[PDB]
Amino acid sequence: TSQVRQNYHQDSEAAINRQINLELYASYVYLSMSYYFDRDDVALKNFAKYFLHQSHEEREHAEKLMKLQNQRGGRIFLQDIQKPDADDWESGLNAMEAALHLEKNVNQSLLELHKLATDKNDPHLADFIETHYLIKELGDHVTNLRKMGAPESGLAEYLFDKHTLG
Amino acid sequence: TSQVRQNYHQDSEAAINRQINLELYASYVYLSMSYYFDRDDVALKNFAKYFLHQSHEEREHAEKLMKLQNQRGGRIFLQDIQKPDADDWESGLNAMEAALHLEKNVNQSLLELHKLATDKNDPHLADFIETHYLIKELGDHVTNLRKMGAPESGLAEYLFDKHTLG
Amino acid sequence: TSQVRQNYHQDSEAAINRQINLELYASYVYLSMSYYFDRDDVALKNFAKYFLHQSHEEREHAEKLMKLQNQRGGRIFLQDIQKPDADDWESGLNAMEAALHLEKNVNQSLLELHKLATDKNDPHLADFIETHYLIKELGDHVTNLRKMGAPESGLAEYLFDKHTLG
Amino acid sequence: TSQVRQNYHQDSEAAINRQINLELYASYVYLSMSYYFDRDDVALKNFAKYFLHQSHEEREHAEKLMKLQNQRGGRIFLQDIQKPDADDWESGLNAMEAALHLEKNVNQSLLELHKLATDKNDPHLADFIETHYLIKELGDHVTNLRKMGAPESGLAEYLFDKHTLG
Amino acid sequence: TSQVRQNYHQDSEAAINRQINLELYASYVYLSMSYYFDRDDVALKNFAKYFLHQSHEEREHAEKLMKLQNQRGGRIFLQDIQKPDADDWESGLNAMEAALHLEKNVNQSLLELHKLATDKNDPHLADFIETHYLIKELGDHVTNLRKMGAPESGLAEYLFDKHTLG
Amino acid sequence: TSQVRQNYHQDSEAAINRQINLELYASYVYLSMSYYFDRDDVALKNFAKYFLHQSHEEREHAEKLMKLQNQRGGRIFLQDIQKPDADDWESGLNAMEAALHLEKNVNQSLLELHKLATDKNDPHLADFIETHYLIKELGDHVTNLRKMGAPESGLAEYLFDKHTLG
Ligand SMILES: [Mg+2]
Ligand SMILES: [Mg+2]
Ligand SMILES: [Mg+2]
Ligand SMILES: [Mg+2]
Ligand SMILES: [Mg+2]
Ligand SMILES: [Mg+2]
Q: Pfam families annotated for this entry (chains A, B, C, D, E, F)?
């Protein structure tokens, strides 16, 4: 056992690992989205940039949670990073929608983590959920793209790319 | 009675107070509008900013009129600030229209104040109506949004947000 | 229902709204105080400034809680902002005392909000109570003004105005 | 009773005081360590500096908790600061080990404080445990010094002094 | 079929995808190594940094090859990113050795890609193998750590961490 | 015995230790005073600052005397730091008076140390009493606060706080 471990639950340890995998997965999703929009037959440079940045942000979450497991005296175990549910993301609107679904799910996993912490009386971990959320952020992007007429309007997706994401 | 009072009418004093309440009310209207457009299902960031600024401007009017009442030797009395006539402002165009109606009304109250001053031979107060008006300003915004096709066109409200209000 | 809502309680939604009204009310109280002290027969410029700043601070709280309701997928509903309990605040000491009573009350409402969050297992909201309190701050001002001899000593209120609030 | 007190428990008040004494004690431990290593027959300048800094950090914790007790309307009561468990700290490795034991103990006292807060529904205090911990930090130093061959290797303690602590 | 495709082989397309997966995998290996050395019971900060940088470098390769597939008119298909062959990397020397084995393997896959290009007369792809290799770089690190006495000498791994990787 | 010891008396060694404890004690007294005046029902910010600085100064003396014991080849032994004679310091004037009594006592202990040095023909130690005294400094503060009417005059303590200590 670790010298620096103290009131860290064996189930807390496993919960952390699951989230790490979870956050790496979201990073892969956003990576896959980004290069979809880099395609010569999709060609939305700012979507591509936008999701490429969100890919970095989630990999950074995984690293924070890795920096957790280690700080708390636990042991990092890494699983396969499963490939995303799509190769073709169809439209900017569709990816924005998929990303909204993904983040709500990731958030739900964090709420569970936070509950487990509370019930194991682990206040340092409940705080390590040091988030600030982009759920509204994609929320907003989805609303706008719909009102502009996406995805049937190809003008809509093109402009939003220049004006909101530019 | 006040040492610094001089040719300030008891009806002038009450008229000022009514306007103060009036100007605070307009500030609340613009506050309520601003956060309507901050909604994830409305998502017009620049409307939101625009009305949030107009909220500050009207609260500032109220403070000028408060700084009046006091300067002139009168006594500030504050009423309830009644909540706006809507929670849902429907569209950017609709708020712009509502705001136009509101400002014309507030202006009408100022003209009455100015008349009362003139008939009480109160030249310092008639001047304290030191305005410069945004009635045309919303006038212009309304015209444009209509010609673009609001509110049926969701593209129209989105672009105007970026281009005129940006 | 909202796309960005998730584990936000309908009673959480109403609780937020009550606080918003509550925080706007405190802003109105401090506004009313400020211009009391701007009176030619009270004439404490730094009290006036001091409470005018606290008015801004509370309106800013209301806006943060508005920025909440919206982020969480809830719906802002605004009530009347009821006028303060006084027009005449009597003395600097008396306003400082009234303000202390007001802030303790507002704080009590926040503790209730925080409890409700905890019992609805709403960790994002319990944190949104991102305060740092001025209860001691008026606490200190009250102690000093009393020891100087307020409000019977008119010298006391005048000096404190220059020295602590200057 | 205090004007600025509100939902602060009499047992919360005593718990704070115990921690204050606790944190001052850790400061004395690190002070005693620092000047051990300043000895002409120990002569590890960077250990000496390192623990002298940690002495400042803990005295600073005590002051934060003092600034608590006062803010919350409670009353500071100070006990004797008991002298450390050693005059001779033996080796750099041994002090690092002792310090690890000390910090885990101090941390355990904080977890208890945090629990008490939670059970007294005192959210402002549970947060005032605004830490970020050096338990891993000495954890790391201990691991390295062991692998280098401390304390039998006098070369090891000398180099680590220059290279990790320099 | 794509408008911008020209002399890009369907087997060239699949070969690219395999390499992308390959390069992402190496990134995961270096990520897993980095946080191994961030452990309180391993505690080699500069190994940790070193492999964390190499993680970034390989993810960057994957992105270049993604930027390929797309440029050439092909279609990106992403597989699972399989978790590394170890959780415990044992020593700095052992990871350096594992990383050497990994890079030789990745290099072998690139030589095959380059051969396939040549035999499909695909000169733009044979060039896209725009590398400059760190095989010698870990080669050198391995030689030094061995000569210092790794991994039995814990002094050796500690110093190399400060002196070569610092 | 120490290699760097020379004409340092075993009674000189014990005398130093007593002073170290003595100087740490004065630091604790000034710490306890400082946070007394930080109380919401005392609220003299500049007293609080003033004594907090004097706390730092005395802890610094202790460290100089520690840096002595070590330089001279002696051995530091630390006792309990006994808690001050008061929790409630009553008034600014009263603390200033208590502090004057404390410093005269600490000074008397230094004169004894200096005598012992002289009689043991220890000129390096008699010099290490490298002081410059604040006995007059509190002397002056006491005189002023009395003439202003402390502690019955609460105006007096408040002004002196702003004007002499500001
Ligand atoms: Mg995330
Ligand atoms: Mg107006
Ligand atoms: Mg507030
Ligand atoms: Mg501590
Ligand atoms: Mg590579
Ligand atoms: Mg002294």
A: Ferritin (PF00210)
> How far apart, in whole angstroms, are the C-alpha atoms of residue B5 and residue B18?
19
Taking the C-alpha atoms of residue B107 and residue B100, their distance in angstroms, rounded to an integer, is 10
3-state secondary structure of C50: helix
User: CA D34, CA E83: separation in Å to the nearest integer?
Assistant: 45
Least distant ligand from the CA of B20: 2
On whether the CB atoms of residues A156 and A149 are closer than 8 A, the answer is yes
Query: Which pair of structure tokens corresponds to residue A67?
Result: 């920096």
Residue E164, phi then psi, degrees to nearest 5: -85, -40
3-class secondary structure, F155: helix
Using DSSP's 3-state secondary structure scheme, residue B88 falls into coil
Q: Which of A88, A84, A83 is nearest to A42 (CA)?
A: A88
- State this model's resolution in angstroms: 3.1
Q: Do B154 and A159 touch (CB under 8 A)?
A: no
| DSSP for residue F131 | -
Q: Which of C51, C89, D4, C161 is nearest to F43 (CA)?
A: D4
Q: Give the rounded distance of the alpha carbon of C24 from its chain centre.
A: 8
Chains D & E: contacts with CB separation below 8 Å: 35
Residues contacting residue D92 through CB under 8 Å, at least 6 positions apart: D37, D44, D47, D145, D150, D151, D157, D160, D161
Nearest in space to B144 (alpha carbons), one of B118, B119, B131, B162: B162
Side chain identity at F136, as an amino acid letter?
K
CA gap F92, F42 in Å, rounded: 9
- Which chain D positions have a beta carbon within 8 Å of E42's beta carbon? 143
Q: Which residues of A touch D108 (CB under 8 A)?
A: 6-7
Whether E96 contacts E137, CB under 8 Å: no
Paired tokens of A50: 């936008």
* Pick from C115, C136, C139: CB nearest D121: C115
Task: Name residue F75's amino acid.
Answer: R
Q: Subunits that touch chain E (at least 3 Cβ pairs < 8 angstroms)?
A: A, D
Structural domain total, chain B: 1
Distance CA D25, CA F62 (A): 16
Could you tell me the CATH number of the domain that includes residue D43? 1.20.1260.10
Distances (CA, A) of E88 to A80, A90, E152: 16, 41, 17
Burial (CB count within 10 angstroms: exposed 0-12, middle 13-18, buried 19+), residue B110: middle
Residues 6+ apart with CB under 8 A from B111: none
The b/e string for D67-90 (b: 16+ C-beta within 10 A; e otherwise) is: ebbbbbbbbbbbbebebbeeeebe
**Touch D-E: 3+ C-beta pairs under 8 A:** yes
Nearest Cα to Cα of residue F84 among F74, F94, F75 = F94
Closest CB from F40, F155, F159 relative to C140: F40
Which structural domain range is residue F162 located in? 1-166
Residues whose CB falls within 8 Å of the CB of residue C37, separated by 6 or more in sequence, listed in order: C43, C44, C45, C47, C48, C51, C89, C92, C95
What does the alpha-carbon distance between residue B116 and residue D16 come to, in Å, rounded to a whole number?
64
Chain F positions in Cβ-Cβ contact with residue D3 (cut-off 8 Å): 40-41
Tell which of C135, C144, C146 to mutate to test the D interface (max D CBs under 10 Å): C135
- Asked how this structure was determined, the answer is X-ray
Contacts of residue A108, Cβ cutoff 8 Å, sequence gap at least 6 = C6, C7
Instruction: Consult the annotation and say whether E90 binds a ligand.
Output: no
